[PDB]
Amino acid sequence: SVIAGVFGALPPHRYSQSEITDSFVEFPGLKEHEEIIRRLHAAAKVNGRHLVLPLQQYPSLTDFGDANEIFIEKAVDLGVEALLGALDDANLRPSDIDMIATATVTGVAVPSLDARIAGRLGLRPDVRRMPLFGLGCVAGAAGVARLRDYLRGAPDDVAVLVSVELCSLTYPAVKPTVSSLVGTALFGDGAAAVVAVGDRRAEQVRAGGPDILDSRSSLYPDSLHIMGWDVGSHGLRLRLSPDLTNLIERYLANDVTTFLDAHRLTKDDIGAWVSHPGGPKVIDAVATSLALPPEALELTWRSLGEIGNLSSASILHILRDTIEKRPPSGSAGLMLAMGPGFCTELVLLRWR
Amino acid sequence: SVIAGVFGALPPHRYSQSEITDSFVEFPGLKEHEEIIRRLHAAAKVNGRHLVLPLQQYPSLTDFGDANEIFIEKAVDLGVEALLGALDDANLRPSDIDMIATATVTGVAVPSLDARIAGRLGLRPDVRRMPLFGLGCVAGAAGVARLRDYLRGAPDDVAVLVSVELCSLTYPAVKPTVSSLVGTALFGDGAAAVVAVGDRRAEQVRAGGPDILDSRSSLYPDSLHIMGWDVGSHGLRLRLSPDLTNLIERYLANDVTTFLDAHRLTKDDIGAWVSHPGGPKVIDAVATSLALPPEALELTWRSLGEIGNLSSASILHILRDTIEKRPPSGSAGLMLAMGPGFCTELVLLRWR
Ligand SMILES: CC(C)(COP(=O)(O)OP(=O)(O)OC[C@H]1O[C@@H](n2cnc3c(N)ncnc32)[C@H](O)[C@@H]1OP(=O)(O)O)[C@@H](O)C(=O)NCCC(=O)NCCS
Numbered sequence: 001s002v003i004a005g006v007f008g009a010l011p012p013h014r015y016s017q018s019e020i021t022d023s024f025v026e027f028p029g030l031k032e033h034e035e036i037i038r039r040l041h042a043a044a045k046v047n048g049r050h051l052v053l054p055l056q057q058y059p060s061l062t063d064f065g066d067a068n069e070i071f072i073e074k075a076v077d078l079g080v081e082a083l084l085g086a087l088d089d090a091n092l093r094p095s096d097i098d099m100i101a102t103a104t105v106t107g108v109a110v111p112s113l114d115a116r117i118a119g120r121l122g123l124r125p126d127v128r129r130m131p132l133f134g135l136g137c138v139a140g141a142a143g144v145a146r147l148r149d150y151l152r153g154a155p156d157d158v159a160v161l162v163s164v165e166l167c168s169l170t171y172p173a174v175k176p177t178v179s180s181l182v183g184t185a186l187f188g189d190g191a192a193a194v195v196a197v198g199d200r201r202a203e204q205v206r207a208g209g210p211d212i213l214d215s216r217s218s219l220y221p222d223s224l225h226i227m228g229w230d231v232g233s234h235g236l237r238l239r240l241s242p243d244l245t246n247l248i249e250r251y252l253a254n255d256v257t258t259f260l261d262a263h264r265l266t267k268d269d270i271g272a273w274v275s276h277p278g279g280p281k282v283i284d285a286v287a288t289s290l291a292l293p294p295e296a297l298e299l300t301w302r303s304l305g306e307i308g309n310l311s312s313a314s315i316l317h318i319l320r321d322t323i324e325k326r327p328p329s330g331s332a333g334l335m336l337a338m339g340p341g342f343c344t345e346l347v348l349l350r351w352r
Numbered sequence: 353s354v355i356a357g358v359f360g361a362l363p364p365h366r367y368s369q370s371e372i373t374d375s376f377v378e379f380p381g382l383k384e385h386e387e388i389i390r391r392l393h394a395a396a397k398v399n400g401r402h403l404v405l406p407l408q409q410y411p412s413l414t415d416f417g418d419a420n421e422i423f424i425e426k427a428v429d430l431g432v433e434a435l436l437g438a439l440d441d442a443n444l445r446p447s448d449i450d451m452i453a454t455a456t457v458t459g460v461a462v463p464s465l466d467a468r469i470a471g472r473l474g475l476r477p478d479v480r481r482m483p484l485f486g487l488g489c490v491a492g493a494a495g496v497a498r499l500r501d502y503l504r505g506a507p508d509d510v511a512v513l514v515s516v517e518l519c520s521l522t523y524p525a526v527k528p529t530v531s532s533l534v535g536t537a538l539f540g541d542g543a544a545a546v547v548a549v550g551d552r553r554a555e556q557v558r559a560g561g562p563d564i565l566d567s568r569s570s571l572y573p574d575s576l577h578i579m580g581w582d583v584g585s586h587g588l589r590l591r592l593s594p595d596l597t598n599l600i601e602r603y604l605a606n607d608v609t610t611f612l613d614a615h616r617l618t619k620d621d622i623g624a625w626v627s628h629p630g631g632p633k634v635i636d637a638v639a640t641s642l643a644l645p646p647e648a649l650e651l652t653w654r655s656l657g658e659i660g661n662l663s664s665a666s667i668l669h670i671l672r673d674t675i676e677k678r679p680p681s682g683s684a685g686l687m688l689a690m691g692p693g694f695c696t697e698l699v700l701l702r703w704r
């Protein structure tokens with residue numbers, strides 16, 4: 001399977017981190033926490049984020065029903081924009097799509113986002129739908145791996161992934177706690193789409209993105225508590241364990257070695273790293289654990305700085321940035337993501 | 353792709369429909385609606401349902417947070433039971449599984465149900481996970497089609513589907529409006545699992561069949577409103593249009609003919625129909641639209657009678673029942689489900 005198109009879409013409202021923080025600390029129930037909010041927002045290594053709503057509107061977003069309804073409307077808009085961009089990048093059309101997978105963790109849609117996107121773009125009525133909910137931050141990488149699994153079975157086909165994460169719309173569940181506030185420092189809104197074709201399809205029409213060579217999941221035993229949602233009448237409330245980085249530091253190198261061993265590669269054989277930007281401590285943990293050079297994760301840092309953490313969409317933005325730097329033809333790339341499970345997902349790529 | 357195991361699991365609290373109705377009309381806020389409640393409950397052609405909680409506990413189930421917490425607890429138990437059962441049917445082990453897909457529409461779990469089930473049964477850390485959320489009642493059929501799509505590219509592999517639907521736990525969102533009350537007439541709790549293997553693995557494990565040959569989705573344009581959830585602070589509230597039956601009557605025959613034509617098959621070639629038991633009017637519409645004999649859908653009527661509508665799990669219970677009845681060897685089978693989209697899914701089978 002071969003990537004043919006990758007495209008990111010962001011809401012038009014762009015704010016500097018300082019702007020967000022300045023407004024945020026004045027929101028109802030937050031003033032008493034100004035100092036810790038400013039401290040966390042400042043330490044995030046995030047310089048700006050796109051938000052799906054204007055800043056002033058968030059204090060009114062206290063009802064999960066309102067927020068989730070807005071999610072549905074805005075996510076379908078952004079998902080459609082990202083898919084169209086990726087299709088244009090691939091020189092393909094909506095009617096070419098044989099399977100669409102959507103990933104989100106920031107809203108609850110039934111019918112799923114893929115059914116709504118299919119309708120908006122006029123995908124064929126027989127398109128195969130794969131609504132992936134609950135993978136969280138791993139879904140960008142895992143989503144690309146699922147496209148490969150599909151296309152390995154259907155090598156004449158075209159399959160697409162659409163990731164849409166509107167983290168700001170979980171506002172009704174935000175509380176003045178360390179975990180929620182860390183969330184408000186890091187997460188932004190955005191979307192991304194990948195268009196991929198099977199090996200035979202790639203021999204019929206031109207696909208210019210990297211080859212998806214292989215993937216490997218790693219679900220860690222007894223780690224349900226590491227990250228996830230607390231779900232309730234206020235919506236989706238972030239649960240984040242302080243043990244996350246220790247887990248990375250202790251186990252990630254083995255995940256990578258195990259996977260790369262199977263391809264008789266070493267970490268020194270990979271020419272472009274495409275890692276999820278969980279946040280500064282996480283990225284630090286990844287670099288340390290894998291003993292990476294200082295610039296290995298430069299595009300990950302740059303993305304976190306520019307647009308924040310978009311959950312599953314971030315790694316796709318970073319993939320696009322990586323493709324655009326045009327890595328050495330024939331060299332290996334490695335996507336690395338992590339998420340609720342706890343789990344990691346690795347995807348081996350070959351550039352050109 | 354060959355099925356090797358199919359297994360159903362039900363919670364232990366079983367009540368007759370009459371017992372459920374008698375209690376329900378006395379729940380807080382309902383006595384005024386006794387007449388319509390008794391009418392809808394009798395018209396459902398459901399004679400009993402299994403419930404995950406004691407019947408008289410439901411009046412206290414008013415908070416979505418409590419209900420979803422109970423969902424996660426109970427859903428993992430039932431999913432594990434179902435999967436273990438299907439593995440036993442297949443004579444396979446948890447460590448044999450290469451990919452697990454889960455399907456639910458009745459609760460919100462991050463980490464997902466597949467991560468939880470994987471942990472409980474000690475699946476391999478590299479098992480591929482596919483948490484399908486939002487397909488609703490089509491997911492039994494679509495899930496089986498997703499297994500085929502995976503195994504088509506992985507002929508030595510084992511892939512499993514676990515459906516868990518605890519419809520009763522959506523009670524916090526129930527009010528005495530017609531749409532909700534219709535739901536209270538029909539839906540029960542349960543789970544099911546399917547174990548399937550690649551064509552190359554099939555001989556090695558002596559898979560009992562049937563073969564999974566092909567599938568086709570049919571998403572109906574401008575139909576998002578037909579069935580789905582309205583999500584908010586009270587959880588998952590049923591949206592269900594009275595127009596659903598009309599859509600089936602107008603378009604199902606074409607869905608089926610379009611699919612069968614591609615295989616040079618006719619309806620008369622089908623040795624056994626495995627159809628989702630949406631409700632009596634739906635089942636009639638299927639029989640009428642396809643000009644099927646009364647016996648064609650008998651096991652679907654029976655399942656509806658015995659356990660109610662289990663959303664995505666019902667078709668799998670019916671599939672198990674059908675296999676046990678042993679349709680003519682080598683004859684064609686057709687799974688038929690429908691759900692939020694609005695959509696239908698057909699799966700072509702060959703019986704052993
Ligand atoms: C619940 C059911 C068994 C009751 O059967 P019944 O007492 O004959 O009731 P009817 O279907 O004839 O409908 C009677 C009235 O209730 C209304 N009604 C039925 N379903 C309704 C719904 N989901 N929402 C709002 N109103 C509904 C009908 O429109 C009708 O209105 P009317 O008085 O103007 O004529 C039947 O409605 C049914 O089986 N519906 C299909 C269930 C379904 O959609 N399953 C989903 C498959 S995926």
Ligand SMILES: *C(=O)CC(=O)CC(=O)CCCCCCCCCCCCCCC
Pocket residue numbers: 020024055058105135136137138167168169170171174180183184185187227228229238239240311312338339340
């Ligand atoms: C990735 O795995 C991260 C997780 O822990 C699970 C997951 O995917 C959820 C990720 C997003 C959590 C977001 C909480 C967001 C609060 C956002 C506030 C935004 C700004 C409002 C400004 C007025």
